[PDB]
Design an enzyme around this catalytic site. Structure first.
Site, mmCIF file in Angstrom:
data_model
loop_
_atom_site.group_PDB
_atom_site.id
_atom_site.type_symbol
_atom_site.label_atom_id
_atom_site.label_comp_id
_atom_site.label_asym_id
_atom_site.label_seq_id
_atom_site.Cartn_x
_atom_site.Cartn_y
_atom_site.Cartn_z
ATOM 1 N N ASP A 119 0.821 -1.200 0.000
ATOM 2 C CA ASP A 119 0.000 0.000 0.000
ATOM 3 C C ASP A 119 0.862 1.261 0.000
ATOM 4 O O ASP A 119 1.951 1.290 0.577
ATOM 5 C CB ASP A 119 -0.929 0.039 1.225
ATOM 6 C CG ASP A 119 -2.003 -1.026 1.184
ATOM 7 O OD1 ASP A 119 -1.988 -1.853 0.259
ATOM 8 O OD2 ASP A 119 -2.874 -1.034 2.088
ATOM 9 N N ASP A 120 0.332 2.300 -0.657
ATOM 10 C CA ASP A 120 0.752 3.708 -0.632
ATOM 11 C C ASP A 120 1.676 4.133 -1.770
ATOM 12 O O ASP A 120 2.042 5.312 -1.849
ATOM 13 C CB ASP A 120 1.448 4.077 0.688
ATOM 14 C CG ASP A 120 0.520 4.036 1.870
ATOM 15 O OD1 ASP A 120 -0.701 3.872 1.665
ATOM 16 O OD2 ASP A 120 1.014 4.163 3.016
ATOM 17 N N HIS A 139 -5.196 9.883 0.169
ATOM 18 C CA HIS A 139 -5.070 9.168 1.439
ATOM 19 C C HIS A 139 -5.793 9.806 2.627
ATOM 20 O O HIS A 139 -5.315 9.692 3.762
ATOM 21 C CB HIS A 139 -3.589 9.027 1.803
ATOM 22 C CG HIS A 139 -3.268 7.765 2.548
ATOM 23 N ND1 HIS A 139 -3.421 7.641 3.912
ATOM 24 C CD2 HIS A 139 -2.802 6.571 2.113
ATOM 25 C CE1 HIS A 139 -3.064 6.422 4.283
ATOM 26 N NE2 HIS A 139 -2.682 5.754 3.210
ATOM 27 N N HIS A 157 3.915 -1.702 3.199
ATOM 28 C CA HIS A 157 3.836 -0.415 2.508
ATOM 29 C C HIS A 157 5.095 -0.212 1.679
ATOM 30 O O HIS A 157 6.192 -0.118 2.233
ATOM 31 C CB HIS A 157 3.644 0.723 3.516
ATOM 32 C CG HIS A 157 2.369 0.606 4.279
ATOM 33 N ND1 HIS A 157 2.246 -0.187 5.397
ATOM 34 C CD2 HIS A 157 1.138 1.118 4.044
ATOM 35 C CE1 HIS A 157 1.001 -0.138 5.836
ATOM 36 N NE2 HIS A 157 0.309 0.649 5.031
HETATM 37 ZN ZN LIG Z 1 -2.185 3.831 2.953
#
Ligand SMILES: [Zn+2]
EC number: 3.5.1.-
Length: 202
Positions: free
Chosen positions: A13-14, A68, A155
């Site tokens: 993620d991200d 986000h 992440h």
């Molecule tokens: Zn995130």
């Protein structure tokens, strides 16, 4: 994907963040595994080449909002725009339409579930690599909790997370895991559940 062998879903993620995402993509390719990347729309816009690469190499892409926010702190209109703007940039770059959404921080309510029109993808192993930004800590937490059928949350924006991911990918591959996408994991579980269908003619 063989449903009678071990499977596990690494999710990231991200990103994209080329410096770290590309290293993880390299590790997956080296060890013949795949993963699922829940991307930020704003970062896809910055780094379209990385979206194309992760798709070209067989990985699954999910929606992680545009910028986000905690989606539950927004009006439904603003929250849906976060999601749809991210669908739109992914489609404009790649022609791909994600079906999986991971709401930032896991925050979601029933109103958004019904209007998003996407499958919410959670996780069950969380080394909190944003909190303990330490390669060995992340590796040991994941390897201690790894098991067949589990979904790991990493992440791909931290150097310690990319370095940890290479070691995790190697060790899981060494243990005989098939590193599959979220959708592939769901399909394997359906294939395994289907053995109960045979009870009908036993
Ligand atoms: Zn995130």
């Amino acid at each position: 994907v063989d449903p009678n062998q071990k499977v596990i879903a690494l999710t990231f993620d991200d990103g994209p963040n080329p410096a770290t995402t590309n290293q993880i993509l390299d590790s997956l390719k080296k060890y013949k595994g795949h993963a699922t990347f829940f991307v930020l729309g704003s970062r896809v816009q910055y780094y379209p080449e990385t979206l194309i690469r992760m798709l070209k190499e067989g990985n699954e892409v999910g929606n992680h909002s545009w910028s986000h926010p905690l989606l539950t702190r927004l009006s439904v209109k603003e929250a849906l725009k976060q999601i749809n703007d991210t669908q739109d940039i992914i489609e404009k770059i790649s022609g791909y339409r994600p079906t999986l959404v991971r709401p930032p921080y896991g925050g979601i309510n029933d109103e958004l579930r019904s209007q998003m029109k996407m499958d919410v993808a959670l996780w069950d192993v969380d080394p909190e690599d944003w909190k303990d930004r330490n390669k060995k800590t992340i590796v040991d937490r994941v390897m201690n909790q790894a098991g067949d059928g589990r979904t790991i949350l990493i992440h791909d924006i931290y150097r310690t997370s990319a370095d940890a991911a290479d070691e995790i990918i190697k060790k899981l591959t060494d243990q005989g895991y098939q590193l599959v996408t979220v959708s592939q994991l769901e399909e394997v579980k359906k294939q395994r559940e289907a053995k109960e269908l045979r009870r009908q003619w036993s």
